[PDB]
């Protein structure tokens, strides 16, 4: 393992981190907002009818803290908690969710048009998949 | 803009995940975890910032917040002086975890990548700083 491939890596992860976090601030939500959107996102990824210990292990939480999040998510109808006890997103999640997304990407857009050409992006489209297989890897 | 939204939507959610992935391999469990968040933060901050700054900084609520320091110094993480630090064991706690996150990335790059995959991500990977940086 060379040190330039220990700099590649700690180039990458501080590009991701980075990124991750400003298209955070671009949500527009105040603190409320935003950790009932990580709840409601994490529920969506997990393809949406999961328990709340799958939802708090997905998302490294501490199981007392989600217990009162879900607690507020469902007074303001953003879930549907049934039946163990599974919860989903209502189509006002969704909507909520969704709506928060097409922001960010609306957001994404306006950078990728200002701050980069064409062939930029189209390294960009190339490259984007690699961070999923990195995501996604087993050793 | 239909292959733009196609573009950002992608790309959006490849970078979020890495990122997701990235704070597995912390191997922590929750209450660790939590934690490290806030070292993070505080480190990002330079590290002589009151819990409200902190708390607003990081679009994150007080209740948690408060909750989360008074680990962080019982830890030894942290130390107060109505401010707030990182000891030496939470700078080297917070840092040994980018070091291992980075070890992890690197396993990850030569195992499932080829050269030129890389070599693509190292060509590409500063068009992310600059998306980040859209001020």
Redesign the interface.
Known sequence: ?TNQ??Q??????????????????E?Q????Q??QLVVLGAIDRLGGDVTPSEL?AAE????S?LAALLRELERGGLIVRHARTRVSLSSEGRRNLYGN?AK???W??R??????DES??A???????????????E?
């Open positions: 393992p491939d220990l590649l890596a700690a180039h990458l992860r501080s590009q991701v981190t980075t990124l991750t976090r400003r298209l955070r601030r949500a939500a105040d603190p409320v935003f950790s708090a490294r939480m501490r199981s803290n997304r960010r990407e609306e994404l857009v950078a990728m048009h200002a701050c980069l930029e992006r390294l960009l489209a190339a490259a984007g998949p690699l961070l999923t297989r990195l995501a996604q890897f050793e």
